[PDB]
From a paper:
Here, we reveal a unique mechanism by which the Legionella effector PieF perturbs host mRNA decay by targeting the human CCR4–NOT deadenylase complex. High-resolution cryo-electron microscopy structures and biochemical analyses reveal that PieF binds with nanomolar affinity to the NOT7 and NOT8 catalytic subunits of CCR4–NOT, obstructing RNA access and displacing a catalytic Mg²⁺ ion from the active site. Additionally, PieF prevents NOT7/8 from associating with their partner deadenylases NOT6/6L, inhibiting the assembly of a functional deadenylase complex.
To understand the binding dynamics of NOT7 with NOT1, PieF, and NOT6 and to elucidate the mechanism of PieF-mediated NOT7/8 inhibition, we determined the structure of the NOT1:NOT7:PieF complex to 2.8 Å resolution and NOT1:NOT8:PieF complex to 3.5 Å resolution using cryo-electron microscopy (cryo-EM). The high quality of the density map enabled us to build a complete NOT1 MIF4G domain (residues E1093–S1317). NOT7 contains most residues (Q10–G263 out of 285), with only a few flexible residues missing at both termini, while PieF includes all residues except for I19–V25 in the loop connecting the β2 and β3 strands. PieF and NOT7 form a complex through a bipartite interface with two distinct interaction regions: the first interface involves PieF’s β5 strand and adjacent loops, while the α3 helix of PieF mediates the second interface. The principal interface between PieF and NOT7 is primarily formed by a section of PieF’s β5 strand (residues S101–F103) and several adjacent residues (K96–G100) immediately preceding it. The β5 strand of PieF assembles into a short β-sheet with the β3 strand of the NOT7 (residues A48–P50). Specifically, NOT6’s β2 strand (residues E33–I36) forms a β-sheet with NOT7’s β3 strand (residues A48–I51). This interaction interface directly overlaps with PieF’s binding site on NOT7, underscoring the mutual exclusivity of these protein interactions.
Residue numbers in the entry:
A (entry chain A): 1 to 18, 26 to 125
B (entry chain B): 1093 to 1317
C (entry chain C): 10 to 263
The structure:
């Protein structure tokens, strides 16, 4: 069961497979710097966010941990995309494909052609 | 000597209107043998003492369209700059300090503004700033205004615009100098003006620790004297 | 020592040698190593050559270069005595950086020491400052040879401009012709060369070239590109390459 992240400008949407995908949450970058978390339909009745986390980026990184079942102290490839979007490193419309463990989707054949320049 | 009075006549009445006509006047008057004399005359007798007529002569070079003459002018500019850098830096030589500013302004216009680099083997700008700092306070009066005039043309270059890695290499060295409590206010004000000319913020620059590495300022290649 | 491995400690000492080589040996064969491709653009594109730039733009802006190899030759295809290739090893953390695992696995097998890169690697901003005034870029008379260099020149432009790639492919090439006025892509030239197909290693067996150095590393791959160009130019192009037909064209881009 793979995952997907779309960065369409000021919004980062996290979706899960269902090759249709259903959004889980979206992290909107508001006017000055504010991030807004908007959970999808069946997300508030599924995931519980502890009151210790307050910032919208902390609950976004907590939901990715719940999604990918990563350890408490980890940064998956899904967290790296979240950390890059929040710091504004993703400035173009791009999609990121992930495995169930949060790492980038494995493409053995494409990597072979890149180093070999085939 | 008759030809000598005709090269001076060509540059004496130059303007944007007759620039194309006077470019042809030079070609039929000065042969290939006398070309090195014209580059020496242009830099020493016109460029060095006339800062207002610098875009006039830069446009003359573009209109002339002679790559061999452009290399002679660039070589003569470096030769004249190094004569002033390796000289006696007296505190009363107000004129010699103005020649370096005019030659620095000319150098940036014909290299940086034309999307061309100032080659390291020709003039190493960053080590010039570091060497002048450790040599003394009179060597900074020659170099900081000279460097500020060279970097003025970086804003008019799509390559050397401030986001350039090499431009902020120089601008971060000047940010370290601006932080010194010994640098005089007349040199601090010149760095502030250069930041405003490049649409930069002196507070947003990133000064390093280049001025505290004494073991690196000892083996600097010497361009001053 | 045909290939010199350049780290942060000897970058300035090896730049002195490079600044004198470029005067006599003005042909620069080059290659880069990068952590792969992880992003795909959104939307519909009017051409396949426009999707390739947006795919190139999406990944260069996010990932960072690992290696760069520079080989210097003259018009006759001859090398400087001693060292002709320089391998620049840049800073790269395998924990804090984004990469494709199939690329890191394929680069580890080649022999890339990713722990040395993290601790003793070069900063790309300091390298670009040194390379700007060396005479290798922005200077007339220098010819750049490459092989399928859409990604290779995107990473070079990224560090040379210290900003993101232009949103339009027109502006990417406008700033490309300034730093690199002449570019020869050997893979693009192979389309007019009879029976030459494949990758760098595949094509450097029809030309019968013997590789020097470890495979899939920037220094040895750039050296192989230089021998590929001058051998292919000797059989198929009659020791002359048209500048109005092959210069500036990158494979896939355009
Ligand atoms: Mg390679």
């Amino acid at each position: 069961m793979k995952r997907l992240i779309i960065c369409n400008g000021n919004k980062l949407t996290v979706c899960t497979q269902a090759e249709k995908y259903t959004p889980i949450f979206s992290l909107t970058k508001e006017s000055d710097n504010e991030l807004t978390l908007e959970l999808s339909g069946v997300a508030r009745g599924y995931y519980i966010i502890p009151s210790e986390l307050t910032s919208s980026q902390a609950r976004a990184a907590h939901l990715i941990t719940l999604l990918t079942r990563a350890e408490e102290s980890q940064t998956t490839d899904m967290h790296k995309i979240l950390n890059s979007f929040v710091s504004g490193k993703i400035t173009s419309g791009s999609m990121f494909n992930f495995e169930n463990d949060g790492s980038f989707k494995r493409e053995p054949e494409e990597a072979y052609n890149l180093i070999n320049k085939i | 000597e008759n030809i000598q009075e005709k090269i001076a006549f060509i540059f004496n009445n130059l303007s944007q209107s007759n620039m194309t006509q006077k470019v042809e006047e030079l070609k039929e008057t000065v042969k290939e043998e006398f070309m090195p004399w014209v580059s020496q005359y242009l830099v020493m007798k016109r460029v060095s003492i006339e800062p207002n007529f610098h875009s006039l002569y830069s446009n003359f070079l573009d209109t002339l369209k002679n790559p061999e003459f452009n290399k002679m002018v660039l070589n003569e500019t470096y030769r004249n700059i190094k004569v002033l850098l390796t000289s006696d830096k007296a505190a009363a030589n107000f004129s010699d300090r103005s020649l370096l500013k005019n030659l620095g302004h000319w150098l940036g216009m014909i290299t940086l503004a034309k999307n061309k680099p100032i080659l390291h083997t020709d003039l190493d700008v960053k080590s010039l700033l570091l060497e002048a700092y450790v040599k003394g306070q009179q060597e900074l009066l020659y170099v900081v205004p000279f460097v500020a005039k060279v970097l003025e043309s970086s804003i008019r270059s799509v390559v050397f615009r401030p986001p350039n890695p090499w431009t902020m290499a120089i601008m971060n060295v000047l940010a370290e100098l601006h932080q010194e409590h010994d640098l005089k206010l007349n040199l601090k004000f010149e760095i502030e003006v250069l930041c405003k000319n490049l649409a930069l913020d002196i507070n947003e620059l990133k000064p390093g620790n280049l001025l505290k590495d004494k073991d690196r300022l000892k083996n600097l290649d010497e361009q001053l004297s | 020592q045909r290939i010199c491995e350049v780290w942060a400690c000897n970058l300035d000492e090896e730049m002195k040698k490079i600044r004198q080589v470029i005067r006599k040996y003005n042909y620069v064969a080059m290659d880069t190593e990068f952590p792969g491709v992880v992003a795909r653009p959104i939307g519909e594109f009017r051409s396949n050559a426009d999707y390739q730039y947006q795919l190139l733009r999406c990944n260069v802006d996010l990932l960072k270069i690992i290696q760069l190899g520079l080989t210097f030759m003259n018009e006759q295809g001859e090398y400087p005595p001693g060292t002709s290739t320089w391998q620049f090893n840049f800073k790269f953390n395998l924990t804090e950086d984004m990469y494709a695992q199939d690329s890191i696995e394929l680069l580890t097998t080649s022999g890339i020491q990713f722990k040395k890169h993290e601790e003793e690697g070069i900063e790309t901003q300091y390298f670009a400052e040194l390379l700007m005034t060396s005479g290798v870029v922005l200077c007339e008379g220098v010819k750049w040879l490459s092989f399928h260099s859409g990604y290779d020149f995107g990473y070079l432009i990224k560090i040379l401009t210290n900003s993101n790639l232009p949103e339009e492919e027109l502006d990417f090439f406008e700033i490309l012709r300034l730093f690199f006025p002449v570019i020869y892509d050997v893979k693009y030239l192979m389309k007019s060369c009879k029976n030459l197909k494949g990758g760098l290693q595949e094509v450097a067996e029809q030309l019968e070239l013997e590789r020097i150095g470890p495979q899939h590393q920037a220094g040895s791959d750039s050296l192989l590109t230089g021998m590929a160009f001058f051998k292919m130019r000797e059989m198929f192009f009659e020791d002359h390459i048209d500048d109005a037909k092959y210069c500036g064209h990158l494979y896939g881009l355009g």
